[PDB]
Write a protein that binds this ligand. Structure first.
Ligand SMILES: Cn1[nH]c(-c2ccccc2)c(C(=O)c2ccc(N3CCCCC3)cc2[N+](=O)[O-])c1=O
Ligand SMILES: Cn1[nH]c(-c2ccccc2)c(C(=O)c2ccc(N3CCCCC3)cc2[N+](=O)[O-])c1=O
Ligand SMILES: [Co+2]
Ligand SMILES: [Co+2]
Lengths: 380, 380
């Protein structure tokens, strides 16, 4: 059931913003590791004396990396005279965020019809304001409300190229990397208590529960067309293996964004290219499942994947799961930085053709029982 | 003249330590960009609840990248019970350093005969103590004194693999990159006032002035065999083109390390490999000199380099200069991070064979007049 109860018109995910201490090094690492092109910049060379911001793109996926300069460069400025291109940015908030959480996501940004209306309706419905609507060059409106922890949900609306004040990067500095990643599929938060978090977010957005079918409890909030998907996890205490959600909260100093799932148009190519680079500056992946898991895949998905395509899943360590409506190919990176906090999922979905409907195949819940069972089978 | 006046026995440069906010991303970027292998680690996986430290090596060059974890992970510890592998590390100092200066060098480390004696003699001769001698696993002694700004000179002595508590990295995580870089040739600091800085450092080390032959004034301090070389720059005010040393001090929030010069055993190969990667996660280089500069190179170094080797310098944008005793090949990267502060020089020296004596060919001072003249010639 989808009650289509969004309180304002939401389009798609627009970008993800990481707060960094050095945006250059993180952006360059991510570009090489994920196959994203340097697309736009806002920094000293564009007149921004406040923050350095670099945008990476792959298809429709937009990753923004921002770090603060010395406050001394802008000590004469006031908000009416700011040279910042993102008016919500604050030196103190950014340093506080990075020192507290380490490298991580500050903003989950969605495109909406009218960011000023989205902000007003959100706050009228319980959202905690973080940055009021600001109109940039009479062309784009940006506003922010608290999502969970120190992560904000950012609303962006366009009257009619990223943001005003950003410049397109020179072709000589912009290498056309592409490993097949095309868009953000979902963004997942970890919180201490799931119930109050869902009630809060569903309260101000009108997002509905998407619904599925040890360690954690989870639920997914979804927009009207189910293209904006926001899962939230809470820990389950008292187990034998300590909850990785609890480990996250401890190392992150509280709630925050746990993983970003990036859709690939060709997950085999994406993983071939990412694994080639794991030990030369890119990203590492979680350990691969035992061969008995792939032995059991023919029995579950052998009507969706050929034997050759399943052994190709085995070569790259890809996991497969299936809903009642579609099939899911997925795999997870090791944490993106020093702390065992944020990581990336690469995903491809097959089925649910109308365009493809959102969340086709689910989020992999069935792989939990399957891997425990595969662990027992490999031991035998 | 070399009075050989070192107040204690100094061996060679040992390592350079960067203080980061995320050591993983900076280390991975530097590894790919410079061709350095991941050699050793000290982090959560090695029991260090205090800081993440990753060591990159190329030949004898050692780059260490360190970032703090949440202080909460080690709140029960005291210095006698620390799980830190570098006992001088302090969460507050590191966060203060990165928030003030951005990504940069915290420690210039030299190997000495006896770090406890080096520390004692240094402080007895005016050095400001930063961290007292500490013996690690009855095997290595580490001590630190202030050098300039928030940069420390770190003394390391070995009774007899980097430091105790560091583990060798798994072969699967350690790709044998190598672009030909072999050792640190010199490390250069920027200060507001050159005279007091030289008097201070030469005062506690016994290092002597190495001696050469607009924008800045400079002098080089050298150890007994002139293998540890520490140039220091000050700005010259009142020019037309504002002093890049002054720009450094402004963007860095004061004195600090300006550039690291890395010796290559094959500067042509190093630059071919580094330039291949500039736009795919590596390092960018300064603009190349006009063709008239290379037209003038035959007249100055045509007895040292063949015509083919000079046009190869032109392809890669390499600068050449010569002392009365040797020849210098050099080139400079753009700044390593967000701020226009620290950068890298790649260097190769030819001549001065006994082994090669330190500083053979100088540091490139003659290229200043040459490029101004090349600028005038290209315009014509
Ligand atoms: C919304 N939603 N829920 C899960 C989810 C999490 C844990 C159990 C069930 C469902 C999402 C995932 O992405 C996900 C899927 C499978 C995973 N594993 C394979 C099986 C054994 C355990 C590890 C790990 C993750 N993960 O969260 O890292 C997700 O997006
Ligand atoms: C100890 N010492 N002194 C210099 C030095 C600096 C500036 C003028 C003269 C000497 C050192 C250098 O490395 C260096 C050499 C040549 C450079 N350029 C080529 C000619 C036109 C200006 C730019 C830039 C740098 N630099 O400092 O970036 C150095 O190590
Ligand atoms: Co997921
Ligand atoms: Co130099």
């Amino acid at each position: 059931k989808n009650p289509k109860s969004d309180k304002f018109k939401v389009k798609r995910f627009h970008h993800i913003e990481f707060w960094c201490g050095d945006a250059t090094n993180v952006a360059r690492r991510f570009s090489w590791g994920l196959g994203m092109r340097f697309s736009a910049k806002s920094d000293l060379s564009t007149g921004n004396m406040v923050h350095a911001s670099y945008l990476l793109t792959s298809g429709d996926l937009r990753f923004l990396f921002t770090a603060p300069y010395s406050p001394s460069l802008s000590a004469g400025e006031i908000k009416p005279t700011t040279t910042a291109s993102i008016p919500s940015f604050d030196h103190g908030s950014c340093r506080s965020f990075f020192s507290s959480h380490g490298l991580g996501v500050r903003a989950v940004a969605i495109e909406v019809e009218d960011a000023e209306s989205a902000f007003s309706i959100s706050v009228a419905n319980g959202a905690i304001p973080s940055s009021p609507p600001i109109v940039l060059n009479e062309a784009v409106t940006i506003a922010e409300v608290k999502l969970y922890g120190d992560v904000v949900l950012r609303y962006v609306s366009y009257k009619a190229e990223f943001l005003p004040g950003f410049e397109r990067v020179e072709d000589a500095s912009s290498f056309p990397l592409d490993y097949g990643i095309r868009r953000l599929d979902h963004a997942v938060g970890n919180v201490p208590e799931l119930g109050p978090a869902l009630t809060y977010v569903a309260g101000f957005t009108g997002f509905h529960q998407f619904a599925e079918f040890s360690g954690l409890n989870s639920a997914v909030l979804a927009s009207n067309d189910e293209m904006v998907l926001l899962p939230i996890n809470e820990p389950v205490h008292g187990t034998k293996r300590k909850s990785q959600i609890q480990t996250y909260l401890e190392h992150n100093e509280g709630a925050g964004l746990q993983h970003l799932a990036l859709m690939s148009e060709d997950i085999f190519r994406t993983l071939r290219e990412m694994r080639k680079r794991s030990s030369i500056g890119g990203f590492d992946f979680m350990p691969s499942p035992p061969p008995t898991y792939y032995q059991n895949l023919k029995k579950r998905v052998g009507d969706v994947l050929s034997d050759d395509q399943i052994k190709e899943c085995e070569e790259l360590g890809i996991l497969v799961d299936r809903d009642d409506q579609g099939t899911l190919l997925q795999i997870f990176t090791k944490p993106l930085g020093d702390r065992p906090t944020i990581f990336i999922e690469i995903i491809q979905r097959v089925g649910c053709m109308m365009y493809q409907s959102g969340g086709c195949g689910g989020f992999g819940k069935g792989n939990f029982s399957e891997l425990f069972k595969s662990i027992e089978e490999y031991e035998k």
